[PDB]
Amino acid sequence: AKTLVDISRAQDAEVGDGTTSVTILAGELMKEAKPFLEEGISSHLIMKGYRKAVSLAVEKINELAVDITSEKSSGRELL
Amino acid sequence: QNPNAGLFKQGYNSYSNADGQIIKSIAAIRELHQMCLTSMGPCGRNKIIVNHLGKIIITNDAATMLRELDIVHPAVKVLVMATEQQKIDMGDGTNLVMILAGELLNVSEKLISMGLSAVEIIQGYNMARKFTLKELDEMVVGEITDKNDKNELLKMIKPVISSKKYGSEDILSELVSEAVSHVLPVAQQAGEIPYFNVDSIRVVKIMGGSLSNSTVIKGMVFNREPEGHVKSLSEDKKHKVAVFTCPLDIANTETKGTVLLHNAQEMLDFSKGEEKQIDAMMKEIADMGVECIVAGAGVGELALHYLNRYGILVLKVPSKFELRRLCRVCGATPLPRLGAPTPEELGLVETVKTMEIGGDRVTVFKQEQGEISRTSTIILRGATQNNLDDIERAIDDGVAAVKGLMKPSGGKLLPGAGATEIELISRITKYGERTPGLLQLAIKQFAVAFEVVPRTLAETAGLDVNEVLPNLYAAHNVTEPGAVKTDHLYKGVDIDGESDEGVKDIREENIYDMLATKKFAINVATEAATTVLSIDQIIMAKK
């Protein structure tokens, strides 16, 4: 559980926002993996399943995140 | 009222074979055997251990973990002492020695319960060990030419980083192999004089950045401040460096010599005396061409003022271990006195500068061409402190792997990733039916004990034991329509992680195991299990 505190201190340092949400998301992701242990699923495929989901998530966030400069806007009208 | 028979000594602990202590001793090792089963392999993980002093040590290496764990049963201490044999000599394979020695006791448990004598169990492993040593010479596929090329080092270093830290093996291999090529001179076909040591590669770390932004320095890297208004020296060639054990201050008497002021008359004489004496000693050093002074002891206030006017870089290294590696680069030597820069004892550095790497400005120590350095340092960067400390322990295992390139069978290699342990099964069982007598029981079980390596890699990877395991036996055992066996000898054990059917070939990823490391690990694991099986009684006393 100290790891959740260690990543929270780095969340407030390198970023400064989402210190509480990063621990809840890591804890809820831990809660979703609880029935996986009771069924006998090893942790290797559990790690590779989430690492692939995050890889597909970052690619989707870049599509969801809108950063525009010369496209139908300028450095002013956007703000 | 109820007496006790069998103990004539004292109320201390007496462990005899009558109650099956030889099984209980293995059961105590089995508790720590599964500990190493969660270590070896890319699915392994570091263990968090809090020292009695309130210090947290995090490392993936199991041999380092054994030093941080309190061992109770002395039978485990025999395996710990045997584990240090693998860490001190070859520096790699500690997971192969401990897990195999624990499995050699597991397969021997079936022989003890069957009624086979423990003496014939030891005699069977001694005959099976000599049969294995003869096969390891004929199982060599490729051989390292010892070219010391950067591309040739990436072949050996990649599997060493593997089964420790996964996914960074492509980035870390370029960082480790670059520092190895810096400390190795230019030579070929000469094994008389050793060159590469275990201290030639220093590992430093800093918070921030990533592994892709890390670089490799050809010399020692210092993370401290220059301690003066001079940030760095010039680019001129062959700067002189002087190492001083005496602190920087006015020359005093070796015995006592405490400065005291009786009256104001002695105040102006002793204050100006420290100003004239230090300036006279620092001027003679700067006139000889020495632009850098290494002070092992403390530095006075008036000393830093005169070094800034002469443009001399200030460096303080209190650690004597860092001074030893400093002498191997420039050639400087610590002088017991102050103010006598003898040119024979001085060193020469090509380039010394203060650059900002990782967010903080550090003063490094490196070279260019001349005065070739035998010591290098790798700068690590990353946003995760837990994974950063694990890489520091993983590089140290890679440094010892480069040392295994020396005369004792350094070039020869065997296919790894479970391909070696499974192939030994068919070769030992071939000699089982060849050797008549009661030795067939221990020889066959000696080959079955090698099944723990492929089973552990398949179990920790989430693969079904009932699926991959029968495919591993069919991979190394095939029926070829001919006298000469052919096709795939490269089929190993695959960790998967994405998807696959069956197994994969070792020739694709070029994951190989050194002969000197594997051959030495078998002899240690055999003698370690020999000691445990030979002990039928253990006598202990309470502390």
All domains in chain B, ordered by first residue: 1-143+412-543 (1.10.560.10), 144-218+371-411 (3.30.260.10), 219-370 (3.50.7.10)
Interchain proximity A43–B462, CB inside 8 Å: yes
**Residue numbers in A near B497 (CB within 8 A):** 44, 48
- CA A42 to chain B, closest CA, distance in angstroms equals 5
B462 contact A CB<8A: yes
Q: Is A42 on the interface with B (CB under 8 A)?
A: yes
Q: Which amino acid is at B526?
A: T
SS3 (DSSP) at B361:
strand
* A55 close contact with B: CB closer than 8 A: no
Contact between chains at A44 and B497 (C-beta distance less than 8 A): yes
**CA B246 to mean position of chain CA atoms:** 35
Nearest CA to CA, how far is A48 from chain B (Å)?
6
3-state secondary structure labels for all residues of B159-200: HHHCCCCCCCHHHHHHHHHHHHHHHCCCCCCCCCCCCCCCCC
Binary contact (A44, B43; C-beta < 8 A): yes
Q: What is the DSSP letter of B449?
A: G
A contacts of B461 (beta carbons < 8 Å): 42, 44
In whole angstroms, what is the distance from residue B149 CA to residue B177 CA? 9
What is the sign of the dihedral through the CA atoms of A25, A26, A29 and A30? negative
Which residues, including other chains, have CB under 8 Å from residue A39's CB and lie 6 or more apart? none
| Alpha carbon distances (Å) from B279 to B104, B241, B248, B342, B346 | 71, 18, 11, 18, 20
Q: Compute the half-sphere exposure of residue B341: CA atoms within 13 Å on the CB side of its CA.
A: 22
What is the Cα B452 distance to its own chain's centre?
Answer: 24
**Nearest chain A Cα distance for residue B384, angstroms:** 8
Resolution in A: 4.7
Cα torsion B105, B110, B111, B112 to 10°: value is: 80
**Distance (Å, rounded) from C-alpha B77 to C-alpha B98?**
12
Experimental technique behind these coordinates: cryo-EM
To the nearest whole Å, the CA of A72 is away from the closest chain B CA by 34
| DSSP summary character for residue B208 | B
Cβ distance A6 to B461 less than 8 Å, yes or no, reads: no
Give 3-state DSSP helix, strand, coil % of chain B, rounded to 5: 45, 15, 40
- Residue B30 one-letter amino acid: R
Is A62 an interface residue toward B (CB < 8 Å)? no
Chain A hits for B381, Cβ within 8 Å:
none
Q: What are phi and psi of B486, to 5 degrees?
A: -145, -165
Cβ-contact B27, B106 below 8 angstroms: no
Cα dihedral B392, B393, B398, B399 sign: positive
User: Mind telling me how many Å the CA of A73 is from chain B's nearest CA?
Assistant: 33
Contact status of B461 with chain A (Cβ, < 8 Å): yes
Q: How far apart are CA B367 and CA B372, in angstroms?
A: 7
Return the DSSP state at A12.
I
